[PDB]
Amino acid sequence: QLHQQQHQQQHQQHQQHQQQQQLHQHQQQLS
Amino acid sequence: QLHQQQHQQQHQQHQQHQQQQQLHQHQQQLS
Amino acid sequence: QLHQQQHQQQHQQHQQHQQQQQLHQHQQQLS
Amino acid sequence: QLHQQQHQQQHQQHQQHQQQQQLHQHQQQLS
Amino acid sequence: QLHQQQHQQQHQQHQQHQQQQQLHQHQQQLS
Amino acid sequence: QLHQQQHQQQHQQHQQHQQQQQLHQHQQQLS
Amino acid sequence: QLHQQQHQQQHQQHQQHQQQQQLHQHQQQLS
Amino acid sequence: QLHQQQHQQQHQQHQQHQQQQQLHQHQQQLS
Amino acid sequence: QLHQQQHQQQHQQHQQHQQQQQLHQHQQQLS
């Protein structure tokens, strides 16, 4: 009995001039 | 009995001038 | 008894000038 | 008695092989 | 009595092989 | 009585092989 | 008696998910 | 009697998830 | 009697998750 949980959060609020910003999220799970 | 969960969230609010920004989300699961 | 769940959310609200922005979402599952 | 001026110039002369080049100009004014 | 001036110039001359070059100009004024 | 001036210049001459070069100019003024 | 040769090869085999990949080949010769 | 040769090879095999990868090849010869 | 040779090789095999990787090859020859 195996339980794998992955959670990622990115929050941005009240901003200006983020030209070419990168928000990358990667998640991998194996068995 | 295997349970794999992956959650990703990106939230952006009240913004201006994010030309060519990247919001990339990648998820992989294997068994 | 295998259970694989993947969830991805991108939310953008109240914005201006995001010319050529990329919101990409990728999900893969294997067994 | 407010006076706002914005000027932008891009000049290119006598060139070759600029495949997929970007000349972007952005201007914003508020009151 | 407020005077706001913004000037931007990009000049390129006698060139070769600038594939995928970026000439970006951004100007913002607020009052 | 306020006077705000911003000047930016980028000059390139007689060049070769600047693939994926970036010439970015940003200007902001507030009151 | 001038001899100029240029050869370029790109080989891809047995692949998956290369969205928006770029395979660019450039060749120039002068005399 | 001048002999100029340029060879470039890019090989990729058995791959997955190379979104927005760049395989660029540039060759220049002058006389 | 001048002989100029340039060889470049890039090999990748059995890989996963190389998003936005760059394989650039540049070659120049003059006389």
Swiss-Prot record, chains A, B, C, D, E, F, G, H, I:
Q: Which organism is it from?
A: Drosophila melanogaster
Summarize what gene deletion causes.
Answer: Substantially reduced viability with surviving males being completely sterile due to a failure of spermatocytes to complete meiosis with arrest happening at the G2-M transition. Defective spermatid cyst polarization. RNAi-mediated knockdown in motor neurons decreases number of synapses and accumulation of the tumor suppressor brat at neuromuscular junctions (NMJ). Simultaneous knockdown of the tumor suppressor brat restablishes the number of synapses at NMJ.
Q: Cite the record's Low complexity compositional bias ranges.
A: 1-30
In Swiss-Prot or TrEMBL terms, this protein is called Translational regulator orb2
Subunit info here reads: Monomer. Upon neuronal stimulation, forms stable amyloid-like oligomers composed of isoform A and isoform B which are required for formation of persistent long-term memory. Isoform A is critical for oligomer formation. Rapidly forms amyloids and toxic intermediates are extremely transient. Unlike in the adult nervous system, remains monomeric in the early embryo. Interacts with the translational regulator bol.
Q: Where in the cell is it found?
A: Perikaryon; Cell projection, Axon; Cell projection, Dendrite; Synapse
Expressing tissues: Broadly expressed throughout the nervous system of embryo, larva and adult including the ventral nerve cord and brain (at protein level). In early embryos, deposited maternally and distributed uniformly throughout the embryo until the extended germband stage. By mid-embryogenesis, highest levels are found in the central and peripheral nervous systems with lower expression also detected in the ectoderm and mesoderm. In adults, high levels are present in the head and body of both sexes with higher expression in testis than ovary. In the ovary, expressed in both germ and follicle cells.
What domain of life does the native source organism fall in? Eukaryota
Function noted in UniProt: RNA-binding protein involved in translational regulation and required for long-term memory. Required in mushroom body gamma neurons for long-term memory in male courtship. Binds to mRNA 3'-UTRs. In its monomeric form, acts as a translational repressor of genes involved in neuronal growth, synapse formation and protein turnover. In its amyloid-like oligomeric form, acts as a translational activator. The monomeric form reduces poly(A) tail length and destabilizes mRNA while the oligomeric form protects and elongates the poly(A) tail and stabilizes mRNA.
Q: What else is known?
A: Lowering pH destabilizes the protein filaments.
PTM remark: Phosphorylation regulates interaction with Tob and oligomerization. Protein phosphatase 2A keeps both Orb2 and Tob in an unphosphorylated form. Following synaptic activation, unphosphorylated Orb2 is bound and stabilized by unphosphorylated Tob. Tob recruits activated LimK which phosphorylates both Orb2 and Tob and enhances Orb2 oligomerization.
